[PDB]
């Protein structure tokens, strides 16, 4: 798929000016660009040298262009992670978007999240991620801050179409402001270390790296850090566990399927946290009685913060049903998370 003429010309000039080597002297007519994703916001494109053009040095043959359609911290964050080799290299940054490394890879599917070697490696990459120092605020205000913010906007929504007004009423019927306070009180008393969290560690943000599909522990990369921040570790792990249940690649409306039965088993959760804990801390040296005590408390911790994943992204999805024009069943998804919230709450 070819972008429209203005984009191709803007893309061309960003590459030509930001990228070194053969890129600097490329003609418009030589420029190769194709759409990875369209839409009004965050369109992605692969830009490329002709195959017949030689590179002069260690410039890339292709790059990813991200057009937008917190900009400071998101940018600084992307730059630091690029420096640290935890994300894609940053080649250019500008008001309209970025030029990034093109990583030959595909995203994991939802079903691959339960594969033990995959899970174990997600565990490890996440632990690593949680261990880094980042020049942002270390006070854990993101979770209930963000939730408070969405609840206020949700409370002020007036829908005009019937099926939407129907859905909003049912969700409103639970007394979300009250339910938020109980949730806050549950987690108030649930210790969780504040660490630098991805906050959206899902299959859509984990790349299965090309070549390394034979590799057991080194075939993955976490990407798309827009929600990242210092936050309770339990949310990051709990949110990941919830993501086993959500498939955002379904092709008919509402364009996701939720399956409560696909939440990891205790056996599965334990397999995750058992990779995470020695990766994060040494831990293999503790007594198996202390290691179980720690593991068991973590399970409760992460399953309790799981509830914040349901509440936050449920609230988020209601806001999106109002302000977003993307083709997704945002209200159906709101209900699904709130269903899962009450189910999980009833399990606990």
Ligand X SMILES: C[N+]1(C)CCO[C@@](O)(c2ccc(-c3ccc([C@@]4(O)C[N+](C)(C)CCO4)cc3)cc2)C1
Residue ranges for the binding site for ATP?
37-43, 66, 101-107, 202, 224
Instruction: Name which of a second copy, ligand X, none residue 24 binds, using a CB cut-off of 5 to 8 Å depending on partner kind.
Output: a second copy
Nearer to a second copy by Cβ, of 83 and 109: the residue is 83
Nearer to a second copy by Cβ, of 97 and 329: the residue is 97
Give the separation between CA 210 and CA 298, rounded to whole angstroms: 33
Question: Helices then strands (H, E): number in the chain?
Answer: 10, 12
Q: Are 97 and 244 in contact (CB under 8 A)?
A: no
Asked whether position 75 contacts a second copy by CB under 8 A, the answer is yes
The partner residues of 65 in beta bridges, in order of sequence, read 45, 99
Instruction: Name which of ligand X, a second copy, none residue 83 binds, using a CB cut-off of 5 to 8 Å depending on partner kind.
Output: a second copy
Residue 200 contacts by C-beta under 8 Å, 6 or more apart in sequence? 224, 226, 227, 228, 239
Instruction: Name which of ligand X, a second copy, none residue 17 binds, using a CB cut-off of 5 to 8 Å depending on partner kind.
Output: a second copy
Give the separation between CA 11 and CA 31, rounded to whole angstroms: 9
Q: Are 196 and 130 in contact (CB under 8 A)?
A: yes
* DSSP-derived 3-state class of residue 33: strand
Say how many residues touch a second copy, by CB under 8 A. 28
Residues 319-338 that bind a second copy (CB under 8 A): none
Sign of the torsion formed by the C-alpha atoms of 126, 130, 136 and 137: positive
Residues 99-118 that bind a second copy (CB under 8 A): 99
Selected binder of a second copy within 138, 169, 170, 217 (CB under 8 A): 138
Q: Which residues sit in the known binding site for phosphocholine?
A: 39-41
Residues 53-72 that bind a second copy (CB under 8 A): 71-72
- Alpha carbons within 13 A on the beta-carbon side of 142: 23
Asked whether position 95 contacts a second copy by CB under 8 A, the answer is yes
Nearer to ligand X by Cβ, of 252 and 267: the residue is 252
Q: Which residues sit in the known binding site?
A: 37-43, 66, 101-107, 202, 224
Return residues touching a second copy (CB under 8 A). Answer: 17-20, 24, 71-73, 75-76, 79-80, 83-84, 90-95, 98-99, 133, 135-139
């Amino acid at each position: 798929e070819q972008p429209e003429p203005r984009t191709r010309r803007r893309a061309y000039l960003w590459c030509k000016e930001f990228l070194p080597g053969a890129w600097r002297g490329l003609r418009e007519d030589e420029f190769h660009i194709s759409v990875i994703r369209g839409g009004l916001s965050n369109m992605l494109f692969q830009c490329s040298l002709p195959d017949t053009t030689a590179t002069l040095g260690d410039e890339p043959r292709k790059v990813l262009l991200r057009l937008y359609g917190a900009m400071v911290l998101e940018s600084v964050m992307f730059a630091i992670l690029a420096e640290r080799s935890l994300g894609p290299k940053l080649y250019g940054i500008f008001p309209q978007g970025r030029l990034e490394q093109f990583i030959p890879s595909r995203r994991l599917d939802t079903e691959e999240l339960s594969l033990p070697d995959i899970s174990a490696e997600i565990a490890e990459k996440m632990a690593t991620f949680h261990g880094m120092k980042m020049p942002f605020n270390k006070e854990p205000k993101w979770l209930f801050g963000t939730m408070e913010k969405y609840l206020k906007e949700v409370l002020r929504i007036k829908f005009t179409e019937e099926s939407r007004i129907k859905k909003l009423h049912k969700l409103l019927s639970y007394n979300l402001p009250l339910e938020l306070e109980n949730l806050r009180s549950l987690l108030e008393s649930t210790p969780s270390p504040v660490v630098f969290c991805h906050n959206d560690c899902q299959e859509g943000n984990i790349l299965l790296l090309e070549g390394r599909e034979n590799s057991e522990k080194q075939k993955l990369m976490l990407i798309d850090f827009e929600y990242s921040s210092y936050n309770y570790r339990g949310f990051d792990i709990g949110n990941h566990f919830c993501e086993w249940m959500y498939d955002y690649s379904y092709e008919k409306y509402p364009f996701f399927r939720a399956n409560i039965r696909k939440y990891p088993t205790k056996k599965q959760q334990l397999h995750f946290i058992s990779s995470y804990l020695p990766a994060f801390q040494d831990f293999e040296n503790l007594s198996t009685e202390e290691k179980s005590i720690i593991k068991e408390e973590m399970l409760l911790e992460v399953n309790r913060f799981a509830l914040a994943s349901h509440f936050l992204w449920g609230l988020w999805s209601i806001v999106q049903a109002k302000i977003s024009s993307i083709e997704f069943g945002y209200m159906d998804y709101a209900q699904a998370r709130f269903d899962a919230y009450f189910h999980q709450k009833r399990k606990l």
